[PDB]
Short mmCIF file of N, CA and C in Angstrom, two decimals:
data_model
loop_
_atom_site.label_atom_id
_atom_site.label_comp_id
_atom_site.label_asym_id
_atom_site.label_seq_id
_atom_site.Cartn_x
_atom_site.Cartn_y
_atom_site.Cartn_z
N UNK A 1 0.87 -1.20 0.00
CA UNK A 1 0.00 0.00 0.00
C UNK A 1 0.89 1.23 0.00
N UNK A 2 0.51 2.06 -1.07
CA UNK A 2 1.21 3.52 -1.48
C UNK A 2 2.41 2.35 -2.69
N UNK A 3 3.49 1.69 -2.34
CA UNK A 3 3.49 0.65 -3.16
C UNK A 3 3.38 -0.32 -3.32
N UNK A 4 2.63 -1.10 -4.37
CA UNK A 4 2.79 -2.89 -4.55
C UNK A 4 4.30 -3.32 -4.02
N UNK A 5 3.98 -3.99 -2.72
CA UNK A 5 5.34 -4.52 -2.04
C UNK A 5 5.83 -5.71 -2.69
N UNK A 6 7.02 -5.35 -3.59
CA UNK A 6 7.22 -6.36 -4.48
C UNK A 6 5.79 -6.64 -5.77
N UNK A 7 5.22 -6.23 -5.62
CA UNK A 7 4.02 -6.05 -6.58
C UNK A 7 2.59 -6.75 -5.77
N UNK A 8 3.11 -7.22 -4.27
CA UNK A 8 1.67 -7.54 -3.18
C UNK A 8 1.45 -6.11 -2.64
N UNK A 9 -0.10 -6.64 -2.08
CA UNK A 9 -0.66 -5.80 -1.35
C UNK A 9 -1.90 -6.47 -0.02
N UNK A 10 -1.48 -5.60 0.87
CA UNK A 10 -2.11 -6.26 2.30
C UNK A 10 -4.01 -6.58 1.66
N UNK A 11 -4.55 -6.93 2.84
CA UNK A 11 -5.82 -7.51 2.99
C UNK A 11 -6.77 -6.77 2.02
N UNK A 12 -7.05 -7.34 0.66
CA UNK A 12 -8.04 -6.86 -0.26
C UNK A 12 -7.72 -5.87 -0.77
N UNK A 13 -6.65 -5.00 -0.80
CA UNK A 13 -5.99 -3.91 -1.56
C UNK A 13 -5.50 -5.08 -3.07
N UNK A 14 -5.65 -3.91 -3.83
CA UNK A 14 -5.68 -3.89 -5.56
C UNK A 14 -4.15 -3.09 -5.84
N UNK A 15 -3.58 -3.25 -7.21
CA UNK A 15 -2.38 -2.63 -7.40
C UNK A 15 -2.24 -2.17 -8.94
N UNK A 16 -1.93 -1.24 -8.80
CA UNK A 16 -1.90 0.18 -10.14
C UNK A 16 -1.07 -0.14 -10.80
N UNK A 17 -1.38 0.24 -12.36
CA UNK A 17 -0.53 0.43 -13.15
C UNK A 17 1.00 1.15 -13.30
N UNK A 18 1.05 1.85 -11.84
CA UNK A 18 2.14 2.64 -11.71
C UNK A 18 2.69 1.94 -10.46
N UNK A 19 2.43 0.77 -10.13
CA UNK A 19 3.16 -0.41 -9.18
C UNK A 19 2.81 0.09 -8.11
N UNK A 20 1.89 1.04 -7.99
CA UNK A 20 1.09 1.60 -6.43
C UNK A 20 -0.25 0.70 -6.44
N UNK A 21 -0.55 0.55 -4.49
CA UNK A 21 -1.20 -0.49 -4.55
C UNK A 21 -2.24 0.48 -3.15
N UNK A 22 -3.70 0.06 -3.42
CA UNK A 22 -5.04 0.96 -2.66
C UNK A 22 -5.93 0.17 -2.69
N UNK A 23 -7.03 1.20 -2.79
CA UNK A 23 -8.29 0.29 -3.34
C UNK A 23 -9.15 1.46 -3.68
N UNK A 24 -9.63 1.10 -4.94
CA UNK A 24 -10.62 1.80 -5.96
C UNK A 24 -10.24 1.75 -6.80
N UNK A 25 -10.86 2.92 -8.38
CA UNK A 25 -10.76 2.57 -9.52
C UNK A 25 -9.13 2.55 -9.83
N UNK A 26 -8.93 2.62 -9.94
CA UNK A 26 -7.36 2.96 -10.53
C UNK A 26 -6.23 1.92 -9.66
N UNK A 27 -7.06 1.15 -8.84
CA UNK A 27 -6.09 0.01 -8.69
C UNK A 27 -6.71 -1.61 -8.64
N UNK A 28 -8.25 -1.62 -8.13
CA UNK A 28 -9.20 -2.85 -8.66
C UNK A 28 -9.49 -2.72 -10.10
N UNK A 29 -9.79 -1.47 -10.65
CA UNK A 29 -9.89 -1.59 -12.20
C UNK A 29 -8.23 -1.09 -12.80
N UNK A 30 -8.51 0.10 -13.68
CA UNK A 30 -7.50 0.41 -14.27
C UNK A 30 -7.50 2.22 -14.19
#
């Protein structure tokens, strides 16, 4: 979270096209 750790992300967080990892559009979608 803030970045895909190694490209994971903690409990139900999603990960961005810019190897940052949240949750909402821009990291469950695109």
């Amino acid at each position: 979270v803030g970045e895909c750790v190694r490209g994971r992300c903690p409990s139900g967080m999603c990960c961005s096209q810019a190897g940052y990892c949240g949750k909402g559009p821009k990291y469950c979608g695109r």
